[PDB]
Amino acid sequence: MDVMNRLILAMDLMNRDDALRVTGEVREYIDTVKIGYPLVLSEGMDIIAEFRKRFGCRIIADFKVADIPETNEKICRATFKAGADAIIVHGFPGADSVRACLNVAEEMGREVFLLTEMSHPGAEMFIQGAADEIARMGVDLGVKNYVGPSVRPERLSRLREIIGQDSFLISPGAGAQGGDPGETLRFADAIIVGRSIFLADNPAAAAAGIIESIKDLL
């Protein structure tokens, strides 16, 4: 996956007008948008097709898929039917649940991203202690795309070590949650950024500023 400027916009605004406007304002800087449940549950799955029509961006559906295999398969089918290029899946529910998603992705020409460790404080309670094993499970399953946390670069580095330099790694938590774009890109292929762009006084200037700060990494 070739992500422009190593920057993925997390579009978590919950109003169609604002989401489209803000994405349009930063469109020259990105070609990849992460769309999650805040926007989808507020405006419908048809929002994905609308983003493709307006921006011709790739769409990662951040749905943190975390059900049994039967239900995971259905969620992935509905998601890819809506035009998502990729879907993010939790690893914590185990290998069969991940495989269910991989199967649908292969059938429909899409990608699965495996979420290993998360960026929030609560991730330390259960996820963190399982994360290396979840990453190894991904490797065993042939997963090529991973998500790990900007806010813990030592954990992000370990995740990179496990999956190898050939796998693709994206990372949320830079900006609002305190992560640093440049440090994160030592290990991740791309950073995910939401609020520090879409809540900024001037979203375009915010995106341009982030990119300026990592210019030597592009």
Added chain:
Amino acid sequence: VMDVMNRLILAMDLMNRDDALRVTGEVREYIDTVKIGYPLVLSEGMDIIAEFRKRFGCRIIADFKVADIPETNEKICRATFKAGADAIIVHGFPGADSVRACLNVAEEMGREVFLLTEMSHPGAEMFIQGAADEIARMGVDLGVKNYVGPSVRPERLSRLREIIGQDSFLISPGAGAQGGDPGETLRFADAIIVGRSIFLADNPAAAAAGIIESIKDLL
């Protein structure tokens, strides 16, 4: 606790509005509580909740297995309750802040959170099972009153019930298609969740009536 008719919750995981409405209508004399998940919501929109309320007046549990950071969890809960869900199901494995975020929205909005502890599928044994007792204890500490645990592992369901106490409300999927037994499950759970063995039946009403007949002494 919510008064679930016949201790039986329909898992409506059909992905077509016409079929989902037909089947739900057919079993309405037996079931007043319906679990709507992402297979239906992502296929037909959040307005499917509105449609179910309009047509059936059933309680709606939004099975969204909420599993994000606190900020995003809050947004998901707000959108879900705005659409008319009575309750939402939240994963415990992302930790206490993520659960608290959902509880705070539910409190503000006058709705309920169900905490999913252990899951029913084989993959649950890899990571979830070993965390489940602690996830349940965390729920009790946070003031969670409603829980989800697996029909297919009676021994685990019993332990979950012990942890949360007799006053907590516990619902349980895995009977029927996944092999769990309704009667045994209801030794510990307040209600069983049943999907495919009802909604794929030639006669979903007869399937529901049959399940209920088999547990009639427990009603």
